[PDB]
């Protein structure tokens, strides 16, 4: 058996390597290379310009935790954007919500979105649920160009300051952004320059952290943006209906305690 | 330059590595293979048996969590053991605490102390503190024989029914122990193992996990063991002297939040 291993420049000096069960698909998109693959231990492993996207194993903990995190904050969701969540993950996590009535998505490789229908039923499942909607394109042109505001922006992709206006704007005035933010084992300068964007126009940016073994350093972190002085920090409400039943990471508490950071890490983001 | 790559039977199907810049020590002691090379971004790096034991880069993560989990809660402790550890940031972490008199090590593999005081010098500093009394022996037999009993035993190494009496035994009515405990993303059979041996004797058995990228799946647990119903989850007393001004993970919050765990391994663990 072959191994896939993952480098870049992104982590230079480490390196983080599956053992291939099988190789399920590959293909040069327009935008990226793509490759799947049932993995010995992980199950099957979506892996985007050499890499790792998502796994079976343990793809629910960072799709719970960026989707449960603004959602159990926000009072009444109606109208949710995710940008970029090709796989579908989010918008999985986002159904189960049954006062939510729209959930547009921005994904610029429709190649990831049909994939993922493919491959990873149980992760792209969302997709059939009528109150999705698909636009394929650039989120940057999206966002410049959508009419509705959204109640919950949700930004699953690998980002600069004219980014964070424009989702400032397509935000309720009581509106909440959560992205994905980098691993703050690696990449601290990253996460300064992004919290210091985010804190130009939102009067709450905070920080979480999830673990997750096949992203870099095993973890991954949440850049949260609030328009209200309240915060991302304290859920409004429990998760108690049948359709929450199956949570695998998140919880009530979990959710508070993704907030409280290394001491590090503080000490780096005090004076932005 | 050469890659450094770590394989196990115990996480089949998924490797870490980390790239060399130089090779500076091996040798076969009595007990393991000892390893130690300065990696390009991690700093140096301890390796035994092929696994990583740690690197300057993020040992402080493991070594405060560990250290200051129970003596923050432990309200004036006397007497320490620590069990394995050989490395000495356990001991570094203990010696900021005036409080403390006395800090017993039993580590079965000399070699492994006197690398550690050779190339590893910001690690294995607390060596030089005159109440450090080193014991060079197997745990299993130390821990049958001491005549002392402590405020707490740290038991820095990678354990059955017999090994934890033991452990009960050289605790004082009100010790508190914290052992090295597993990953949450790989071997939750184990953990509950641990918990089920440890619940035995001790009337309060906690587990934590501290984030962690050079121990595999990025993060590794803490058992936590009380006499008292009472527990490890609250921290007693603030670190705000001096000596901890320069901690770089552990703080008051943290603590407490890395008690929080993912809902699937609340399931797991719920019933034992
Ligand atoms: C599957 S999760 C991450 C996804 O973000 C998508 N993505 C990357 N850049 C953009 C962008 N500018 N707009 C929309 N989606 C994007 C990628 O194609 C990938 O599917
Ligand atoms: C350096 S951290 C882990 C340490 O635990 C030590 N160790 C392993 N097994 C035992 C044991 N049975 N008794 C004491 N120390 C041990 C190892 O030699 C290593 O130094």
Same mark, same amino acid.
């Given at each position: 058996?072959?191994?896939?291993? =993952?480098?870049?420049?992104?982590?230079?000096?480490? /390196? +983080?390597?599956?053992?291939?069960?099988?190789?399920?698909?590959?293909?040069?998109?327009?935008?990226? !290379?793509?490759?799947?693959?049932?993995? #010995?231990?992980?199950?099957?492993?979506?892996?985007?310009? @050499?890499?790792?996207?998502?796994?079976?194993?343990?793809?629910?903990?960072?799709?719970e935790m960026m989707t449960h995190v603004p959602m159990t904050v926000?009072?009444?969701?109606?109208?949710?954007?995710?940008?970029?969540? @090709?796989?579908?993950?989010?918008?999985?996590?986002? %159904?189960?919500?049954?006062?939510?009535? !729209?959930?547009?998505? %921005? =994904?610029?490789?429709? #190649?990831? $979105?049909?994939?993922?229908?493919?491959? +990873?039923?149980?992760?792209?499942?969302?997709?059939?649920?009528?109150?999705? &909607?698909? +636009?394929? =394109?650039? /989120?940057?042109?999206?966002?410049?160009?959508?009419?509705?505001?959204?109640?919950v922006?949700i930004?699953?992709?690998?980002?600069?300051?004219? +980014?964070?206006?424009? $989702?400032? &704007?397509?935000?309720?005035?009581?509106?909440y952004?959560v992205?994905?933010?980098?691993?703050?084992?690696?990449?601290?300068?990253?996460?300064?320059?992004?919290?210091?964007?985010?804190?130009?126009?939102?009067?709450?940016?905070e920080?979480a952290?999830i673990?997750?073994?096949?992203?870099?350093?095993?973890?991954?972190?949440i850049?949260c %943006?609030?328009?209200?002085?309240?915060?991302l920090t304290?859920p !409004?409400?429990?998760?108690?209906?049948?359709?929450?039943?199956?949570?695998?990471?998140y !919880?009530?508490?979990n959710h508070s /305690?993704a907030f409280?950071?290394?001491?590090?890490?503080?000490?780096? $983001?005090?004076?932005?």
């Open positions: 058996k072959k191994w896939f291993s =993952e480098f870049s420049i992104m982590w230079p000096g480490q /390196a +983080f390597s599956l053992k291939i069960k099988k190789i399920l698909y590959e293909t040069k998109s327009k935008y990226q !290379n793509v490759l799947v693959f049932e993995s #010995t231990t992980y199950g099957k492993v979506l892996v985007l310009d @050499g890499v790792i996207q998502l796994t079976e194993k343990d793809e629910f903990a960072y799709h926000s009072k009444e969701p109606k109208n949710v954007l995710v940008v970029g969540g @090709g796989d579908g993950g989010i918008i999985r996590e986002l %159904c189960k919500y049954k006062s939510v009535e !729209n959930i547009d998505i %921005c =994904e610029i490789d429709e #190649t990831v $979105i049909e994939v993922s229908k493919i491959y +990873f039923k149980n992760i792209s499942c969302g997709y059939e649920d009528k109150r999705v &909607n698909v +636009f394929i =394109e650039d /989120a940057s042109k999206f966002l410049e160009n959508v009419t509705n505001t959204y109640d922006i930004v699953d992709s690998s980002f600069n300051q004219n +980014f964070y206006e424009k $989702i400032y &704007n397509a935000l309720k005035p009581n509106g952004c992205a994905q933010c980098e691993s703050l084992w690696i990449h601290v300068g990253t996460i300064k320059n992004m919290i210091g964007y985010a804190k130009k126009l939102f009067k709450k940016v920080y952290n673990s997750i073994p096949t992203y870099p350093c095993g973890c991954i972190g850049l %943006c609030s328009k209200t002085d309240t915060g304290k !409004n409400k429990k998760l108690e209906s049948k359709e929450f039943a199956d949570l695998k990471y !919880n009530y508490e /305690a409280k950071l290394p001491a590090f890490l503080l000490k780096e $983001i005090e004076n932005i």
